[PDB]
C-alpha cells in the first residue's frame, strides 16, 4: 500500500533526523487517511495530549524529465573547477507518490583529467548516493550512464546536485584552467513514475486537491456549468478563475469549460438551485450558499468541487467569499454567510508590483534567504528580479537611485577586482573592490570588508519585467615563482553578501505611456491591471455564450489576475453594448464587437465571418524608439480578403466615450480560430510576441503591427 511506503518514509526521516521529510510524509498520510491509529500516533511524536486522546477514542503516470526542459536555458551544462556544482530540480504533488525513479546521464570528460582521481558525484538533497569514477577508456569519449534513484528519499520539493571534482596534474595544477571540464548533454534526464492516490474527501487543505504549489506544471483545472450561463454566473466564474490564476501565478492558467458534461480531472461545478446539472440531479435543495467536494461518480480518483446556491446572487457571494479569506474550510458542506465588502484600492497597488511611492528595501524584493549571497572560487552573480508597472516614464531627470551595502572578501590584488551591475543583460557601471596588499609580496605567504555605494541609473527603457545582476569578478593569480622551483597558491573560497539595508527607489518616474500598446496588456494586463481588483473594467460578453467564449473570458481573466497579485473581485461582466455608453472605464470585448463601436473608423482590423480587412502602416521598424512616431504609424492602405481559413486577432483602440479609457477586444470567427486564440492567450511564450495595436494569430504564428492614432494616457505636468 502507498501508506506503507509513507510510514517507511516516516521512520526513515526520524532515522536521519530530518524534520522536513517526516513533516511532509505526515501531511501526506493525514491527507490520504487520517483515521487509522498509526497516523495519529506518528503525529503524536511530531498539543501532545490531543493526539493521545483521539488514539484512545490506482492510475500511474510515466513522464520524461530531460535536461532540455528543467535546466538553465542552454540545457547543456559544462562543469568546471570553478563551478563544479550543477542542480536539477523537480516537484512531486501532494496527491501522488513516486514508485520508481531512474536517472540517466550522458557526459564527456575532458581528455586531460587524471583517471580514478577525477570523479562525478550526485546529491539528492545531500545524501550522497553514489560516485562515478572516470576510467581510461572514457577519458575523452562520450559515455552513457544510468543510475537508480531510491524512491524513499524523494519529497515534495527536491533537487539533484552534480558535483565534479577532477585533477590534471599531481603538483602545480592551475585552478580555473580550461583544460579540465565535464560537459553534460541535454539528452540526459530523469525517469520516474508517479502514482495517484484516492485522497480523503476533505476541504481542510483547500485547494490542494485542485491546486498544489508543489506542482510546477500548468494548472489546467476545468469548469463545468449547466449550459448558457447567465450574467451573474459569468461574473462568479470569472472571479473564481481570477483567484485561481492569482494563486497559481507563473505556472500557467487554462480553464476549459463543459456544458452538462462530466470532466476527466479535478474541476469546479457551478450549480444553482434550478437548472441543476444532469449528474447533480436529486441533490437536496439548499437555503444558503454552500461549498462541498464530491467524488466523481465513475471513479473516486477524480475530485470535484461543487458551488451551490439558491440563485446567481448566492453564487456570486460564494465566489467573492472564495476569493477572500475567513471561510475556514473544514470537512464538507461549508456554508458562506454574508461577506464584507473589500476596502477601496489605490491605483498601482498590486502585491506583485514593486512599490513606487516610497523607497523599497532589498529585503522585501528577496524571495528566499540565500538569494542575496554567493560563495566559491568564483562567486555566482546575484540576481534580483523585480516586477514593475508598464507605464513608468522618465522626463529628463535622474532615474533609479539605489544605495548598496555589500560585503566582500579581500581580493589578492590591490586594484583589479570589480563589481559589475547589469540590468536586462546590459552593463551599467563598475566599482573596484579595495585592497591593501601589493602583488610583489604575494609569494611570501581575516576579516570581511564592507562597502557602501550610491548608484544612479538612466534607465530610459524598463519594460513590464526586468532583473538586476551583480557580478563580482576577482583576479586569481596563476602559479608563479622560478621555473625550477614554483609555488602555487591554495585556492580559497570567497563570499560576497549584499545587505538587506540596500534600497531602490522609483519615486522620480511618471505614469505616462503611449497608447494603444497591447504588449503591456500581454505582459502586465494594462490598462485593466491598473486597478488590482478590476473595479474600472466592464466586460462585454455575447448573449448566450458558447464554450469557446466562456473559455476565452476565463483564460483572459485568469492571466490578468495572475500577472497582477490580487484577484478581480469587482469585475463587471455585461451582456449588451448599450450600457457602456456614458461610463468611465476600460471596456474589454470578448468574441465580437458592438455595432456602435464597429463603425467609429478607429478599428484597424475586423474579422467578420470569412471576410476581414487590415490597415497596413506606412513603414514598420523592427526596433522602435521611446517616443512613438505618428508619421510611421499612419495608415497607408486597407486590403480586404475573404477565405475559409481560421484566424483570430487581438486589437486595441481608444474608447469613443472617454479620452483616457481604452478598449481591447479579442475577436474570432470560427471554433478553430477560438482554439488558436485561447492557445495564444494561455501561453506565456506566444503572448510575449505581440505588440503594436493589431496582433493577428494565424496558424504560422503571431504577426503583430502598429497602426492608427496615438493617444497618451496618464498625468504629465509642465516641462
Author numbering: 26 to 71, 80 to 90, 1068 to 1455, 1460 to 1733
What does the primary publication say about this deposited structure?
To improve the resolution of the BcsB-BcsC complex map, BcsC’s TPR#1–4 were fused to the N-terminus of BcsB, after its N-terminal signal sequence and separated by a linker. As also observed for the wild type Bcs complex, cryo-EM analysis identified a fully assembled Bcs complex together with (likely dissociated) partial subcomplexes containing three to five BcsB protomers. Although additional BcsC density similar to the one described above was also observed in a fully assembled complex, the highest quality map revealing the BcsB-BcsC interaction was obtained for a tetrameric BcsB assembly. In complex with BcsB, TPR#1 is oriented with its interhelical loop pointing towards the center of the BcsB semicircle. It interacts extensively with one side of CBD-1’s jelly roll, as well as the region connecting the jelly roll with FD-1 (residues 208–220), Fig. 3b. The helix’s C-terminal end fits into a hydrophobic pocket formed by the CBD-1/FD-1 connection. Due to this arrangement, the observed BcsB-BcsC interaction is only possible with the last subunit of the BcsB hexamer.
The minimal components of the E. coli cellulose synthase complex include the catalytically active BcsA enzyme, a hexameric semicircle of the periplasmic BcsB protein, and the outer membrane (OM)-integrated BcsC subunit containing periplasmic tetratricopeptide repeats (TPR). Additional subunits include BcsG, a membrane-anchored periplasmic pEtN transferase associated with BcsA, and BcsZ, a periplasmic cellulase of unknown biological function. Cellulose is a common bacterial biofilm component produced by a variety of prokaryotes, such as Escherichia coli (Ec), Salmonella enterica, and Gluconacetobacter/Komagataeibacter xylinus (Gx). These Gram-negative bacteria synthesize cellulose and secrete it across the cell envelope via the Bacterial cellulose synthase (Bcs) complex.
